[PDB]
Amino acid sequence: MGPCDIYEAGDTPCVAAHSTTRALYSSFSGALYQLQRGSDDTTTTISPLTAGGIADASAQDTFCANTTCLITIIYDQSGNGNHLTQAPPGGFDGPDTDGYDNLASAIGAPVTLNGQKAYGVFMSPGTGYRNNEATGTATGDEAEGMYAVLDGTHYNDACCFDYGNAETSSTDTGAGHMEAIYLGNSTTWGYGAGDGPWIMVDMENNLFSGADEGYNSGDPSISYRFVTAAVKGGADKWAIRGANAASGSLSTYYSGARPDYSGYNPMSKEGAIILGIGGDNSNGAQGTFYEGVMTSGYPSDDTENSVQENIVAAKYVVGSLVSGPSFTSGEVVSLRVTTPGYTTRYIAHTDTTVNTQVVDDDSSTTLKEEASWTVVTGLANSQCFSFESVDTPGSYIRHYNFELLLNANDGTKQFHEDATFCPQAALNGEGTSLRSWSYPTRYFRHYENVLYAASNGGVQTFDSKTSFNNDVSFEIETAFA
Numbered sequence: 399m400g401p402c403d404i405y406e407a408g409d410t411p412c413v414a415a416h417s418t419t420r421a422l423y424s425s426f427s428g429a430l431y432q433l434q435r436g437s438d439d440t441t442t443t444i445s446p447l448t449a450g451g452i453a454d455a456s457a458q459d460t461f462c463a464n465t466t467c468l469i470t471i472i473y474d475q476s477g478n479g480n481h482l483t484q485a486p487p488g489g490f491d492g493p494d495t496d497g498y499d500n501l502a503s504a505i506g507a508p509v510t511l512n513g514q515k516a517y518g519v520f521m522s523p524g525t526g527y528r529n530n531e532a533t534g535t536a537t538g539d540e541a542e543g544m545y546a547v548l549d550g551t552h553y554n555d556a557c558c559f560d561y562g563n564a565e566t567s568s569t570d571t572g573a574g575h576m577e578a579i580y581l582g583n584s585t586t587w588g589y590g591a592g593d594g595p596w597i598m599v600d601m602e603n604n605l606f607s608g609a610d611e612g613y614n615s616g617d618p619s620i621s622y623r624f625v626t627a628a629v630k631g632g633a634d635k636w637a638i639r640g641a642n643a644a645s646g647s648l649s650t651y652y653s654g655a656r657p658d659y660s661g662y663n664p665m666s667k668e669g670a671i672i673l674g675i676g677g678d679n680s681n682g683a684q685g686t687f688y689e690g691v692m693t694s695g696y697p698s699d700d701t702e703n704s705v706q707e708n709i710v711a712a713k714y715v716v717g718s719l720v721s722g723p724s725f726t727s728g729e730v731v732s733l734r735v736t737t738p739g740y741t742t743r744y745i746a747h748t749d750t751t752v753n754t755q756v757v758d759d760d761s762s763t764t765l766k767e768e769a770s771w772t773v774v775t776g777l778a779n780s781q782c783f784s785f786e787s788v789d790t791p792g793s794y795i796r797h798y799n800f801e802l803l804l805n806a807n808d809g810t811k812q813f814h815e816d817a818t819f820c821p822q823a824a825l826n827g828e829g830t831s832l833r834s835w836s837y838p839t840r841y842f843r844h845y846e847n848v849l850y851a852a853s854n855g856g857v858q859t860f861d862s863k864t865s866f867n868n869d870v871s872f873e874i875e876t877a878f879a
């Protein structure tokens with residue numbers, strides 16, 4: 399019995415069931431999600447390895463070898479056709495072609511489920527999925543449940559990392575026109591105890607941590623690396639439940655009346671589905687989605703408790719973000735360019751500008767230090783790495799407007815995320831490619847001898863697909879200094 403078999407048994411069946419990690423029905427063996435690769439722009443689907451089983455991650459690794467992959471579609475396993483696709487422009491434009499939101503990397507969110515590798519949906523700011531043509535989803539004041547298993551440590555305070563019911567126009571049509579899980583440390587509207595992040599409910603013109611606008615004491619800060627967020631809503635009732643998706647039970651952080659403010663009772667739900675964005679296409683948020691559903695009707699505590707027990711038995715554990723040669727903390731390296739015609743150039747810097755330059759045993763000591771990097775434990779992720787300047791200690795390679803800069807560590811979360819890179823076996827097979835931890839669609843990429851955090855295709859000039867594989871591949875060499 400999968401989560402959707404459990405909801406079904408409670409007479410509150412799934413009407414949308416979305417996972418890149420596993421089947422949510424014991425008898426589901428169809429496509430979980432679709433991949434598109436940058437090498438030829440073709441697509442494939444990933445299914446469970448067994449009916450009711452875990453995603454075929456090895457089939458993703460095969461399709462995505464020596465290239466980059468986007469998740470184009472998260473299929474609805476319920477049969478309602480409620481597939482999640484690239485989110486369209488709305489009240490806000492996204493950063494992608496015609497104001498669409500970015501697709502997620504296929505490889506930003508590696509996990510194992512009971513020891514078996516799978517991939518979640520790692521969503522950087524500007525990433526979003528949507529279905530504005532959804533069937534069987536609750537509308538008006540009709541009862542619904544939902545849950546998502548999310549990364550409790552991947553979040554920001556920008557609007558809005560949501561999963562659930564939103565507006566079919568992708569615009570703000572008012573209070574009560576949304577009911578979606580929120581995860582992050584936004585304090586623009588609601589917040590809970592501590593420093594966050596919180597699970598809140600986006601009802602539009604508000605994230606609610608409970609009955610009141612703003613502070614509600616009973617909504618705790620989330621500790622867990624994997625968080626089960628379970629939200630439900632009916633006729634002037636709604637609840638927030640939270641669990642460690644790896645251990646134990648759901649606790650109820652809110653349950654009772656609609657917030658007693660203009661437009662939240664009755665609700666005006668439109669039945670659209672969003673992931674990673676606000677209802678109005680607010681696209682500043684980040685977070686990671688592994689699995690989730692939306693139901694018809696108001697699930698009992700008992701149904702959700704059984705879903706949580708099943709989630710625990712799926713045994714979510716952090717996967718490896720790193721492949722290829724990789725590094726040790728304290729090692730000093732030079733990174734050689736492998737692109738034919740630039741194979742004597744190394745990653746260097748001129749002040750804050752990270753670039754490539756010819757470096758050999760006759761270069762000035764100045765340039766030798768600028769082309770030498772102390773590798774340290776990743777500032778935002780201890781599996782990955784940060785690249786510290788030899789000539790400027792305490793300064794690291796960080797992306798900013800997708801250009802690589804050498805900036806001083808200012809101790810902030812944002813700097814740490816922008817300065818964390820995950821070594822990957824080079825796309826051209828010569829050494830390492832360095833994937834952005836925070837924007838895993840992007841890699842260290844030289845373009846006109848300057849370093850960018852470039853995507854394999856995209857809206858920036860430095861995202862050119864020409865020579866991408868070569869331009870993101872670097873040999874790890876003894877530091878000049």
Ligand SMILES: *[C@@H]1O[C@H](CO)[C@@H](O[C@@H]2O[C@H](CO)[C@@H](O)[C@H](O)[C@H]2NC(C)=O)[C@H](O)[C@H]1NC(C)=O
Nearest residue numbers: 554555583584585586593594809810811812813
């Ligand atoms: C959300 O949490 C982050 C991380 O703790 C907060 O980060 C601080 O943000 C301010 C400016 O926004 C910086 O000056 C601090 O240096 C940040 N701290 C760290 C450790 O990075 C952020 O403020 C929180 N947002 C809200 C609304 O509370």
Ligand SMILES: *[C@@H]1O[C@H](CO)[C@@H](O)[C@H](O)[C@H]1NC(C)=O
Nearest residue numbers: 463464823824825826827828
């Ligand atoms: C593909 O990437 C792997 C890992 O770097 C490497 O062994 C292989 O040689 C590469 N092949 C091509 C065609 O680039």
Ligand SMILES: *[C@@H]1[C@H](O)[C@@H](O)[C@H](CO)[C@H]1OS(=O)(=O)O
Nearest residue numbers: 558602603604605676677678
């Ligand atoms: C409206 C968006 O669709 C929600 O995600 C967000 C919070 O409820 C709202 O933003 S607004 O700025 O309050 O309109």
